[PDB]
Amino acid sequence: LYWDDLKRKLSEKLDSTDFTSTIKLLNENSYVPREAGSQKDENLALYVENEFREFKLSKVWRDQHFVKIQVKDSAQNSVIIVDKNGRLVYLVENPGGYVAYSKAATVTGKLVHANFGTKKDFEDLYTPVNGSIVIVRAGKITFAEKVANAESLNAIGVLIYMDQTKFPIVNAELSFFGHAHLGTGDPYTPGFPSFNHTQFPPSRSSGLPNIPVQTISRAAAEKLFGNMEGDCPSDWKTDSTCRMVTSESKNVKLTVSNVLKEIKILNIFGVIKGFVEPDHYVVVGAQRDAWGPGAAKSGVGTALLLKLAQMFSDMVLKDGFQPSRSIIFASWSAGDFGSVGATEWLEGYLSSLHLKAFTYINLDKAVLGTSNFKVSASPLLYTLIEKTMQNVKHPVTGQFLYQDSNWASKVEKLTLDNAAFPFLAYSGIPAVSFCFCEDTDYPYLGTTMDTYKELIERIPELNKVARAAAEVAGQFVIKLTHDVELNLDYEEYNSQLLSFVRDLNQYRADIKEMGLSLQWLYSARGDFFRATSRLTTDFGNAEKTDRFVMKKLNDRVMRVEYHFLSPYVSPKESPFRHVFWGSGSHTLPALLENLKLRKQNNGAFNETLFRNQLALATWTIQGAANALSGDVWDIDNEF
Amino acid sequence: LYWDDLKRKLSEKLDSTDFTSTIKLLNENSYVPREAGSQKDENLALYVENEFREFKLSKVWRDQHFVKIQVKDSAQNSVIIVDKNGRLVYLVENPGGYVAYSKAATVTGKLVHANFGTKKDFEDLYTPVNGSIVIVRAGKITFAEKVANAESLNAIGVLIYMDQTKFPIVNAELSFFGHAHLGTGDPYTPGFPSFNHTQFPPSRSSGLPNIPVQTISRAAAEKLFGNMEGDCPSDWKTDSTCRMVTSESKNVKLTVSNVLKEIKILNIFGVIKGFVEPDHYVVVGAQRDAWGPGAAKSGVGTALLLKLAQMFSDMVLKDGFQPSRSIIFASWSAGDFGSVGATEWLEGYLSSLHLKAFTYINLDKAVLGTSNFKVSASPLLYTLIEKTMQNVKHPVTGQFLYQDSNWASKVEKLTLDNAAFPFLAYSGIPAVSFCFCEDTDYPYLGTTMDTYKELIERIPELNKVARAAAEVAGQFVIKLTHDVELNLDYEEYNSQLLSFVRDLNQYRADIKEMGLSLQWLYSARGDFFRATSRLTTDFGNAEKTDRFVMKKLNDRVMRVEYHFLSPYVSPKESPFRHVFWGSGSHTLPALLENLKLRKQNNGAFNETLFRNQLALATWTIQGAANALSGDVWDIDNEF
């Protein structure tokens, strides 16, 4: 069949599927407080597992794991205003939720209020946090980062609350759940999978806070500010009520008693064998666990995952759809703690997954509104996102998703808090991640309010919306399989690489003060350009009939993304090796970021570090070239 | 054509090729003191380059490199006996040769004599070297190691001499050239290629001595012993004359003044495109540089490389030989400094070479005698070495190389001083390395006596011998190409892996005192066994006609070797990642080696280190499995 056929079919199938029902079903008390590694969790897990079997799809299995999660200890966590003694005031609050992996301790002192988790940026404010508890709004960044910065400035204890402007929740007595891990997955098995607790049981601090972090209810926040002299700025796009510092007369004490708890995570798979490259998959994932009922955080996703798996299998058996490459749906777990489920899976194929999975889609938080349509992905999927947004019509507006007034669409970078991030920044798998987002992030998200009710009360046509999301997700899959040529934009990296070279030339002056020639970099960038030009050529000259010559090419394409992972840094030390989207000194952006400091004439610039950064970042790119072909044995022997 | 045909052809071609002539030609003053990066060097380089062109073989190019080599400074290096003041006797000697990368310094003190470069083992002798110069025989290990150990015991300065028993050289006034780098290639570009000196110019100590090392003439050794009280043991399979310690009355002073010198290494390639898998090569290398005339150290090799390249090209054009996979001959340079030439090439494809080169043969020191036939390689080439030694007849004895009385032949491990070692321990390419060796190593080897004359004066039928070497090398190539199935013994690793598990079970007691379950290891070992069993099956069921299904399999085979390189250690830190043949704490052998210390009840055993060693070494193997198939997504979801 041809695209139109698959497009048309997939549509009518989408035209007759009740997503709202399943989003509800995944709310019955049978599996509501489906916390990570809970019974409910395990319940839905087996539900999905069976549904897959019922869907009559090919092989479907389970993925067991024992990771250390953190939970609220029998002892109550609390915030209390008190002086250099005598715990005055009422018990401000015994928080209902908590920030996982938070430092298990209790301390007291001054209480500064650094708008939006310091943002690392916001820390450049008047009042110093040098040895004092800090308050921050849940927003621009992740708790992990909020805390991280707080501690980088020598603070202690951090409280996170949902202000009224940012979080228009009627109830101010509401509490939410936190993370706090500056990473992805179990914080004790970095790069390599976990075992038992009995075996390999380190405690923590392996990229974990070391500073108590507690989520606080707006109501509680109110009271805190009540005992603060300072006055909240207008710079902060907020609204009245908050202060900046507690009234000298007295301070506050934070006491968090949480405990680690080894749980058994259960990832559930299920594939749809392909017909020509049966061993090249398209991983389609969806977080299945959640703190509250997480109808949004986890419902819609798993909802789509199921309904989406139900369709393709059907299309394959009844409609004649013959995916040239297999599809593999996966419902991760323990996701509220850093994709711990999906990550430790990846941790499992540390150097071969890219030889298997060529693209990772992600349905998490797919439906949260009806205004915008944010999209984050690897440039390799840029043209797919584009051409697809040109085929899918908004659920509310009768118009197409793609803004016809541009030629350059907006694509966002993947964040530390997205199951897709690990797939791309750690496993080297290109990954997309769409969202029918809103200018303001869903409020009930990390709280017990993520009910199917308050959701649909806030998004009436949730069915049509989810449908659209399930459509863009569907086309991605049909597209990434329908044809014999693996369609990934390995070109977009030429651009991505040139942009780097450019931004780097803005320091050609600094580069000159230092003996650096910066010539080897251009060579790589070029030695790589040719590589892509050949591939881009060989394809054209090859026939979509020589299963052999095509396979040899698609494999090269399939190498592109992975090979941009610094082969000079250990996963055990710095898991996000991707020079472009990773995190670490190996990061390409990190290079410039250090060089920028050169001008500051201070010591902030580590020259020896740069020297290497450049040196390796060069060979990384170079290698990416020699690996992406050049007909092997690249013969630019001159230079 | 069929094997017999190729075997028969290759033979008559070998029957009519004068190897002795070329071994001589590569001795004319046109290129005699062909030191690394010298003019002569560059002369022969262009000779080979052109010869290849003349051979009418396909593409042939050059490989430029700028590495830092160490040379003898204008100031004379010397050893002199002197009391707690001034030289009483005489300046023992002003050594004619030197040990490269040796610490540039000068010190004096006591002089102990630890037979055979301490061997690391021999250091467990009576007299302590705690702060004193040491003497050692050139033998069982490499200078690098000899020195390394000396310094690990806090010694200073090391003298290396060629005793009479081990080195039956008539002349005792003879001096030889050394190495001293505990690694491979330029000691400042570990894992990543080098540049200019102007750019990236660190000094050293990046895996280098830090202790002066000087080669000494037997004559000089005589004199040293002359001023020593101690008496040489019989344990030392040596002969009279040497002492153990200098006569208390006085000590010795070592002064080495060497300087670094950036040179331009020139690797010369040349391939023979294949007909079905044109992009899968069989790298055939041969060191081209040498200190002295190195007729043995470098002559025979390059001699073979050329003559051997001359044949296959001919066979392809005239005889109809259609190698299914391309062959690529390479004459490295700067090899006397740790394969600096070949290594920095590999350094260049840090994560893709294995996708290209599937086996590395090495012709260095191929002919050194006519008694034995030592052979070192990766178990993956075990059956090839075997079946071939069953086809090649000894040059002297009319009988076949293979000892018909056994079913298990002897294969040696690759040493830090063999260009083949890096290919296997760093790039993950299986590599063989034969030698028509002798019970005693060639004496003139590292000295100005490595002439084509003294060679042929010591090996009369050098032609026939070289021919044989050229034959086993030839068959390896024909064999690794002739057929469509990539013939590598990926099974032999099951054994190699079981042997580990076995040796490890001898400590099940220790493993028990520690909470360790050691169960995950067996799973890996097994999860891998199946992997091979499928591959070993899929092959049989596939037809040597489906270029596609075969290519998909051969590629899996081609992954086997590489995937045993710890993906948890950085090449920049520990270049030899191969868990089996590498060097480092990631090494499988290194694991047991630490565990053995457990019983010693002392602190010598680092428990935290072990815990990880095992933990990772497990996932390394595990991964090797998940990468070698299991039909992808290995479904041993239970456990």
DSSP B247: -
User: Do A188 and A206 have their domain in common?
Assistant: yes
Any domain includes A236: yes
Q: For residues B338 and B181, is the Cβ–Cβ distance under 8 A?
A: yes
Structure tokens at B251: 């000590």
Size of interface A-B (CB pairs under 8 A): 143
- Closest-CA residue to B274 (of B321, B312, B308, B322): B322
Contacts of B65 in chain A (CB under 8 A): none
Q: For residues B220 and B89, is the Cβ–Cβ distance under 8 A?
A: no
User: Do B213 and B271 have their domain in common?
Assistant: no
Structure tokens at A160: 């996170």
In A263-282, the residues whose Cβ lies within 8 Å of chain B are 269, 271, 279, 281
DSSP A268: E
Q: B67 - beta bridge partners?
A: B263
- Strand B133-137 and strand B158-161: the pairing is parallel
- The alpha carbon torsion through B47, B53, B55, B60 (nearest 10 deg) reads 100
- Angstrom distance (rounded) from CA A207 to CA A148: 9
Any domain includes B476: yes
Q: For residues B325 and B277, is the Cβ–Cβ distance under 8 A?
A: yes
d(CA B478, nearest CA chain A) in Å: 21
Give Cα separations from A574 to A191, A566, A584, A585, B568 (angstroms).
8, 10, 7, 9, 10
Q: Which amino acid is at A424?
A: L
User: Do A3 and A44 have their domain in common?
Assistant: yes
- Tell whether B520 lies on the interface with A, counting CB pairs under 8 A: yes
Q: For residues A195 and B520, is the Cβ–Cβ distance under 8 A?
A: yes
Q: B134 - beta bridge partners?
A: B112, B158
- Angstrom distance (rounded) from CA B601 to CA B110: 34
- Closest-CA residue to A579 (of A521, A633, A512, A518): A521
Q: For residues B252 and B297, is the Cβ–Cβ distance under 8 A?
A: no
User: CB distance A349–B548 less than 8 Å?
Assistant: no
Any domain includes B322: yes
d(CA A196, nearest CA chain B) in Å: 9
Contacts of B192 in chain A (CB under 8 A): 568, 615-616, 619
Collapsing DSSP to helix, strand or coil, A133 comes out as: strand
In B54-73, the residues whose Cβ lies within 8 Å of chain A are 59, 61-64
- Angstrom distance (rounded) from CA A115 to CA A244: 9
- Angstrom distance (rounded) from CA A136 to CA A116: 5
Element spanning B386, H or E: helix B382-389
- Closest-CA residue to B303 (of B480, B455, B142, B457): B455
- Tell whether A352 lies on the interface with B, counting CB pairs under 8 A: yes
Structure tokens at A471: 């459509």
Q: For residues A440 and A12, is the Cβ–Cβ distance under 8 A?
A: no
User: CB distance B632–A570 less than 8 Å?
Assistant: no
In A185-224, the residues whose Cβ lies within 8 Å of chain B are 191-193, 195-196, 198-200
CATH number at residue A227: 3.50.30.30
- Tell whether A351 lies on the interface with B, counting CB pairs under 8 A: yes
Q: For residues B220 and B91, is the Cβ–Cβ distance under 8 A?
A: no
User: Do A304 and A426 have their domain in common?
Assistant: yes
CB burial readout B308-324, b (16+ within 10 A) else e: bbbbbbbbbeebebebb
Vertex A126 angle, CA A125 and A132, to 5°: 90
Domain count, chain A: 3
- Tell whether B611 lies on the interface with A, counting CB pairs under 8 A: yes
- Angstrom distance (rounded) from CA A543 to CA A276: 15
Q: B272 - beta bridge partners?
A: B327
What is the distance of C-alpha A449 from the center of its chain? 22
In A454-483, the residues whose Cβ lies within 8 Å of chain B are none
d(CA A228, nearest CA chain B) in Å: 48
User: Do B214 and B276 have their domain in common?
Assistant: no
Q: For residues B56 and B253, is the Cβ–Cβ distance under 8 A?
A: no
User: Do A229 and A81 have their domain in common?
Assistant: yes
Vertex A152 angle, CA A149 and A158, to 5°: 55
Alpha helix positions (H), A483-599: 492-505, 508-513, 519-541, 547-560, 588-595
Q: Please provide the DSSP assignment of B103-139 as one string.
A: --EEEEE-EEE-TTT-TTTTTSSSS--TTSEEEEES-
- Tell whether A611 lies on the interface with B, counting CB pairs under 8 A: yes
- Strand B374-377 and strand A374-377: the pairing is unpaired
Contacts of B63 in chain A (CB under 8 A): 637
- Angstrom distance (rounded) from CA B458 to CA B91: 34
User: CB distance B199–A637 less than 8 Å?
Assistant: no
Q: For residues A209 and A147, is the Cβ–Cβ distance under 8 A?
A: yes
Any domain includes B348: yes
Q: Please provide the DSSP assignment of B475-521 as one string.
A: HHHHHHHHSSS----TTHHHHHHHHHHHHHHTTHHHHHHSS---HHH
What region, left, alpha or beta, does residue A200 occupy, with left being phi > 0 and alpha being psi -120 to 50 degrees? left
Structure tokens at B559: 């992954």
User: Do A569 and A538 have their domain in common?
Assistant: yes
Placement of tokens 């409020």 in the chain: A443
Q: Which domain holds residue B428?
A: 1-73+259-492
- Tell whether A53 lies on the interface with B, counting CB pairs under 8 A: no
Any domain includes A639: no
CATH number at residue A517: 1.20.930.40
Vertex A532 angle, CA A529 and A536, to 5°: 135
Structure tokens at B550: 């075969």
Other beta carbons less than 10 A from residue A23's beta carbon: 25
Give Cα separations from B271 to A101, B46, B61, B615 (angstroms).
57, 16, 9, 42
SS (H, E, C) B177-198: CECCCCCCCCCCCCCCCCCCCC
Residues 6 or more apart in contact with residue B157 via CB below 8 angstroms = B107, B109, B133, B134, B211, B212, B213, B214, B254
Q: Which of A206, A239, A256 is the last residue of a domain?
A: A256
User: Do B297 and B341 have their domain in common?
Assistant: yes
DSSP B30: G
User: CB distance B635–A59 less than 8 Å?
Assistant: yes
Q: For residues B164 and B546, is the Cβ–Cβ distance under 8 A?
A: no
- Report the residue of B266, B637, B638, B639 to disrupt the A interface, i.e. the one with the largest count of A CBs within 10 Å: B637
Give Cα separations from B307 to B361, B391, B392 (angstroms).
15, 20, 18
User: Do B450 and B582 have their domain in common?
Assistant: no
Give Cα separations from B6 to A582, B280, B316, B341 (angstroms).
52, 20, 11, 32
Q: Please provide the DSSP assignment of A345-409 as one string.
A: HHGGGTTTHHHHEEEEEE-TT-BS-SS--EEEE-GGGHHHHHHHHTTPBPSSSSSBSS-TT-SS-
d(CA A611, nearest CA chain B) in Å: 7
> Nearest-CA residue of chain B relative to A555?
B552
Any domain includes B474: yes
Element spanning B280, H or E: strand B277-285
Structure tokens at A104: 């298990």
How many residues appear in chain B?
639
- In angstroms, this model's resolution equals 27.0
HSE-up of residue A426 (Cα within 13 Å, Cβ side): 29
Any domain includes A396: yes
- Angstrom distance (rounded) from CA A312 to CA A474: 8
- Angstrom distance (rounded) from CA B218 to CA B239: 13
- Angstrom distance (rounded) from CA B216 to CA B161: 5
User: CB distance A568–B563 less than 8 Å?
Assistant: no
Residues 6 or more apart in contact with residue B201 via CB below 8 angstroms = none
- Angstrom distance (rounded) from CA A577 to CA B570: 12
User: CB distance B349–A626 less than 8 Å?
Assistant: yes
CATH number at residue A340: 3.40.630.10
Instruction: Give residue numbers after which chain B breaks (C–N above 2.5 Å).
Output: none
Residues 6 or more apart in contact with residue A126 via CB below 8 angstroms = A244
User: Do B397 and B444 have their domain in common?
Assistant: yes
User: Do B131 and B51 have their domain in common?
Assistant: no
Q: Which of A461, A492, A523 is the last residue of a domain?
A: A492
- Report the residue of B276, B329, B350, B555 to disrupt the A interface, i.e. the one with the largest count of A CBs within 10 Å: B350
Q: Which of A256, A283, A307 is the last residue of a domain?
A: A256
User: CB distance A632–B196 less than 8 Å?
Assistant: no
User: What is the number of helices (H) and of strands (E) in chain B?
Assistant: 18, 15
User: Do B14 and B123 have their domain in common?
Assistant: no
Which residue in B195, B269, B351 is closest to A623 by CB distance?
B351
- Angstrom distance (rounded) from CA B138 to CA B214: 12
Residue A252 phi, psi dihedral angles, 5° rounding = -125, 150
HSE-up of residue B60 (Cα within 13 Å, Cβ side): 23
Give Cα separations from B549 to A52, A327, B628, B630 (angstroms).
30, 20, 15, 16
Residue B530 phi, psi dihedral angles, 5° rounding = -55, -50
> Nearest-CA residue of chain B relative to A280?
B632
Structure tokens at B332: 């490295």
- Strand B78-82 and strand B251-256: the pairing is antiparallel
Give Cα separations from B376 to A321, B157, B405, B436, B476 (angstroms).
53, 32, 20, 12, 14
Element spanning A39, H or E: helix A39-54
Give Cα separations from A450 to A179, A333, A445, B441 (angstroms).
17, 18, 6, 78
- Tell whether A571 lies on the interface with B, counting CB pairs under 8 A: yes
- The alpha carbon torsion through B555, B560, B563, B565 (nearest 10 deg) reads -130
Contacts of B639 in chain A (CB under 8 A): 64
Any domain includes B568: yes
- Tell whether A572 lies on the interface with B, counting CB pairs under 8 A: yes
- Closest-CA residue to A127 (of A304, A292, A245): A245
Give Cα separations from B266 to A238, B44, B54, B272, B302 (angstroms).
66, 10, 19, 20, 14
Contacts of A349 in chain B (CB under 8 A): 623, 626-627
